């Protein structure tokens, strides 16, 4: 099965797994418990297969929204942090690791979209979405544009649509209501209507995808884009003097990007649940533990208040956390696959003009 007296940890190959092993070495140095950190291929789907056998790692690191399915299959142990520890993490991150009212993982890091802007073209980026049309008029007169971001993917257009009241599934008391969907309320209509109006008035092009936006910003052709921390490295090499800030408001309300919380779950089959709890609470989720991982591969914003306040000296990370706190936790239920397909069709249909915004959002709500 899973052998006792040691910890096996699975984490994806793009994370700082050697820094995590350094934290595992400190744990072993204090307790004699060997901690081995591996990054298998196809990790997201290998864990359910290997855990449902009774096998697998003791701890698995993944985006919170996948853990919902794990917990549904009874693959994750309910965790037992006390009030003092829970108070060390930002409260919204705990909401990301609830399934049917129960905590099933420890939040580690926090990720969301931000407003990325060219300081040379735009030293004072707009605070509101309603400012962009006039701003695009000015920059059109200089051979530039105000804003280009991926319109083909709902993940990128959702911050605007959700600003004035849209939502995927309503979250209440650690549970999602599958029957309360907020893609067709007045807030979503107002947001998508603005998106389409920006396209009609020639301020954005409806075919703009990831590649077009990324090259357009990194070549100095647009003053702003919308992207996440995974994108900063390409901008660094592009020699564009860029900043990262809070997304514009819409109708005075913050933009609501989806939030992904990298979290550590404990295998229900683990005979080392108490050792995992001790490692995760007393060694990893500390300033020293998160710093070891971050120095390997940057975590971005982190759920641990004390270390985030240090990381937030980087205003890009501060902006990521601000947009996360104002955002929508990505639901951890299987019906999100229907939400993606539905919202994707509606945005493409509304942005293409093949359908009005009202007609578009009525169809997305119905299946």
């Amino acid at each position: 099965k899973i052998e006792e007296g040691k910890l096996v940890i699975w984490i994806n190959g793009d994370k700082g797994y050697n820094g995590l092993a350094e934290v595992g070495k400190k744990f072993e140095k204090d307790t004699g418990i060997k901690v081995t950190v591996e990054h298998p291929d196809k990790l997201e789907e290998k864990f359910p297969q290997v855990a449902a056998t009774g096998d697998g790692p003791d701890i698995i690191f993944w985006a919170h929204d996948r853990f919902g399915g794990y917990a549904q299959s009874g693959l994750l142990a309910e965790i037992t942090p006390d009030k003092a520890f829970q108070d060390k993490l930002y409260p919204f991150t705990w909401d990301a690791v609830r399934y049917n009212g129960k905590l099933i993982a420890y939040p580690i890091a926090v990720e969301a979209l931000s407003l990325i802007y060219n300081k040379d073209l735009l030293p004072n980026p707009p605070k509101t979405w309603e400012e962009i049309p006039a701003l695009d008029k000015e920059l059109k007169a200089k051979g530039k544009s105000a804003l280009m971001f991926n319109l083909q993917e709902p993940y990128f257009t959702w911050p605007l649509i959700a600003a004035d009241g849209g939502y995927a599934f309503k979250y209440e008391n650690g549970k999602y209501d599958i029957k309360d969907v907020g893609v067709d309320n007045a807030g979503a209509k107002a947001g998508l209507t603005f998106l389409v109006d920006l396209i009609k008035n020639k301020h954005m092009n409806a075919d703009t995808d990831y590649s077009i936006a990324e090259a357009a910003f990194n070549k100095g052709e647009t003053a702003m884009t919308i992207n996440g921390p995974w994108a900063w490295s390409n901008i660094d090499t592009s020699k564009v003097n860029y900043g990262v800030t809070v997304l514009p408001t819409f109708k005075g309300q913050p933009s609501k990007p989806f939030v992904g919380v990298l979290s550590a779950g404990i295998n229900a089959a683990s005979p080392n649940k108490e050792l995992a709890k001790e490692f995760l609470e007393n060694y990893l989720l500390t300033d020293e533990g998160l710093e070891a991982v971050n120095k390997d591969k940057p975590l971005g914003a982190v759920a641990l208040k004390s270390y985030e306040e240090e990381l937030a000296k980087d205003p890009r990370i501060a902006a990521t956390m601000e947009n996360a706190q104002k955002g929508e936790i990505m639901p951890n239920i299987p019906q999100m696959s229907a939400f993606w397909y539905a919202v994707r069709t509606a945005v493409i249909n509304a942005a293409s003009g093949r359908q009005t915004v009202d007609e578009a959002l009525k169809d997305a709500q119905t299946p």
């Epitope: 994806n12 190959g13 793009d14 997201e44 789907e45 996948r66 083909q152 993917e153 709902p154 993940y155 995808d209 990831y210 590649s211 990324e214 996440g228 995974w230 992904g260 999100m336 696959s337 229907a338 993606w340 397909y341 994707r344 069709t345 493409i348």
Partner: nanobody, 125 residues
Framework: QVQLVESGGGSVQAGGSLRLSCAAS????????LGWFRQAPGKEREGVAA????????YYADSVKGRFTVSLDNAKNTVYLQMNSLKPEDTALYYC??????????????????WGQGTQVTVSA
């Protein structure tokens, strides 16, 4: 669980071509992204080609752009990698992958939740 069965592999000479296939089974309707990745002996896994399943947009690594084409037959639930003008550096284990949503460039592999078996395309000089 979305499942992928892989096929199409082979060993051919340079200047020849090959067509890889990858059959998708299950809840495959809501998929938004399909990609082909390869891993050379003892190297990193590399995005080769990706396809946004909705409006059919395509993305290609510089190494294969203009030589490879990714295509999806919806009526047959099968994504193809047409590999024209094969070079010896095309030798690698090739994987296909699927995802519902994507925050990143479609050519980045950590994006994708589902994966195939990995077949050894071999191209000799």
């Amino acid at each position: 669980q979305v499942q992928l069965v892989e096929s199409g592999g082979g060993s051919v000479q340079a200047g020849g071509s090959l067509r890889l296939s990858c059959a998708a089974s299950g809840k495959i309707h809501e998929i938004g992204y399909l990609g082909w990745f390869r891993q050379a002996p003892g190297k990193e896994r590399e995005g080769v080609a990706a396809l946004m399943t909705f409006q059919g947009q395509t993305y290609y690594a510089d190494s294969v752009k203009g030589r490879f084409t990714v295509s999806l037959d919806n009526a047959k639930n099968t994504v193809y990698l047409q590999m024209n003008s094969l070079k010896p550096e095309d030798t690698a284990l090739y994987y296909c992958a699927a995802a519902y949503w994507g925050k990143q460039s479609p050519l980045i592999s950590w994006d994708y939740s589902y994966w195939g078996q990995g077949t050894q395309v071999t191209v000799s000089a």
